[PDB]
UniProtKB/TrEMBL annotation, chain A:
Stretch list, region Heptad repeat 1: 1-47
Source organism: Middle East respiratory syndrome-related coronavirus
Part of the whole protein covered: 998 to 1046 of 1353
Name this polypeptide is given: Spike protein S2'
UniProtKB/TrEMBL annotation, chain B:
SUBUNIT field: Homotrimer; each monomer consists of a S1 and a S2 subunit. The resulting peplomers protrude from the virus surface as spikes.
Post-translational modification: The cytoplasmic Cys-rich domain is palmitoylated. Spike glycoprotein is digested within host endosomes. Specific enzymatic cleavages in vivo yield mature proteins. The precursor is processed into S1 and S2 by host cell furin or another cellular protease to yield the mature S1 and S2 proteins. Additionally, a second cleavage leads to the release of a fusion peptide after viral attachment to host cell receptor.
Domain notes: Fusion peptide 1 (FP1) and fusion peptide 2 (FP2) function cooperatively and have a membrane-ordering effect on lipid headgroups and shallow hydrophobic regions of target bilayers. They are considered as two domains of an extended, bipartite FP. The membrane-ordering activity is calcium-dependent and also dependent on correct folding, which is maintained by an internal disulfide bond in FP2.
Source domain of life: Viruses
Family listed: Belongs to the betacoronaviruses spike protein family.
Protein name per Swiss-Prot or TrEMBL: Spike glycoprotein
Organism: Middle East respiratory syndrome-related coronavirus (MERS-CoV)
Purpose: Spike protein S1: attaches the virion to the cell membrane by interacting with host receptor, initiating the infection. Spike protein S2: mediates fusion of the virion and cellular membranes by acting as a class I viral fusion protein. Under the current model, the protein has at least three conformational states: pre-fusion native state, pre-hairpin intermediate state, and post-fusion hairpin state. During viral and target cell membrane fusion, the coiled coil regions (heptad repeats) assume a trimer-of-hairpins structure, positioning the fusion peptide in close proximity to the C-terminal region of the ectodomain.
Subcellular location: Virion membrane; Host endoplasmic reticulum-Golgi intermediate compartment membrane; Host cell membrane
Length: 49, 49
């Protein structure tokens, strides 16, 4: 119980930054946010001749 | 609005305080201007439509 709770305790403290899964999560939010907003910023202003 | 050599459609607000202040636009990493200058002399930061 105290070892289970100790395990969950280090599971509380550790998200950033060296703990991917979490960098996979921000790879996802930065993925679709990057695609949406940043690709839409490449699409407009500017493309054409 | 329709400024000096630049067109555009924006909602000016009295914002603060980031710029050059001697030449009179401010861009944000693209073609767009976000956006104060020109008024005499304040900070009318613009936005998209
Ligand atoms: C910190 C700041 O931006 N304050 C502005 C002030 O300079 C301006 O005179 C007033 C009138 O619109 O609005 C507010």
């Amino acid at each position: 119980a105290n070892k289970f709770n100790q395990a969950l305790g280090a599971m509380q403290t550790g998200f950033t930054t060296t703990n991917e899964a979490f960098q996979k999560v921000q790879d996802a939010v930065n993925n679709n946010a990057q695609a949406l907003s940043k690709l839409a910023s490449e699409l407009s202003n500017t493309f054409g001749a | 609005y329709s400024l000096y050599g630049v067109s555009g459609r924006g909602v000016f607000q009295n914002c603060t305080a980031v710029g050059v202040r001697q030449q009179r636009f401010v861009y944000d990493a693209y073609q767009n201007l976000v956006g104060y200058y020109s008024d005499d002399g304040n900070y009318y930061c613009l936005r998209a439509c």
